[PDB]
């Protein structure tokens, strides 16, 4: 069994619908639902948590005055079920704020650290879905990376656009986020780590690998 956190950006920018028929929020929710359905129908023993960032309310163990705001643990590290499918389909809505993705990463890491205690997993995994529109702080990022390595956590980033035809009108903040993702993945896995950065279009199959 593996332990997976789906770390999903639900911030306001994700709701903007200007590519195809679905906004990035709708696309990411669909992938999440299809993945969870696959896991349920297959009777997989993997445990799957869901952390949302950009939520209007805050609900996580690290939250305090000005810390880890607008990040919510929607599902703890457990086998998935149909209640979760129903819960995600009808509850998970776009947020009206933005949040710091490295705060969300830390919340996800803390969730794994606590809830895998004393148990054996084949891998620990965090999959981030985001358009990288939100600002973030790099404070103590070197410690985040050190702890990702120590815990042997694998990281995947999924974006609603390619980062390799016409340019796609990415903001400076999105370009900064892309570069930071590249810095993190290179820090974890060198050149091979940069290959762990994917599109929403490819995300469902890359999760199942």
């Amino acid at each position: 069994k593996s332990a997976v956190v789906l770390c999903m950006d639900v911030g306001l920018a994700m709701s903007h619908s200007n590519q195809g028929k679905e906004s990035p929020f709708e696309q990411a929710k669909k992938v999440m639902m299809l993945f969870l359905q696959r896991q349920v129908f297959a009777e997989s023993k993997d445990e799957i948590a869901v952390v949302l960032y950009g939520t209007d309310t805050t609900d996580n163990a690290l939250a305090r005055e000005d810390q880890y705001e607008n990040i919510s643990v929607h599902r703890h590290l457990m086998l998935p079920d149909f209640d979760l499918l129903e819960q995600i389909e009808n509850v998970v809505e776009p947020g009206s704020v933005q949040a710091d993705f490295l705060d969300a990463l830390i919340v996800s890491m803390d969730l794994l650290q606590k809830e895998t205690l004393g148990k054996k997993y084949t891998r620990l995994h965090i999959a981030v879905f985001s358009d990288l529109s939100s600002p973030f702080s790099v404070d103590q990022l070197e410690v985040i990376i050190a702890n990702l390595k120590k815990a042997e956590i694998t990281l995947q980033f999924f974006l609603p656009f390619s980062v390799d035809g016409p340019g796609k009108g990415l903001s400076d903040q999105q370009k900064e986020g892309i570069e930071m993702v590249r810095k993190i993945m290179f820090s974890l896995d060198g050149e091979e780590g940069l290959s762990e950065v994917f599109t929403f279009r490819d995300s469902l199959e890359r999760l199942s690998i």
């Binding site: 690290l62 305090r64 490295l102 803390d110 650290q113 702080s137 404070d139 410690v143 985040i144």
Partner: peptide, 12 residues
């Protein structure tokens, strides 16, 4: 830069 406070286990 905005300072964050990491959980104690990360600072071990």
């Amino acid at each position: 830069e905005r300072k964050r406070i990491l959980p104690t286990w990360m600072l071990a």
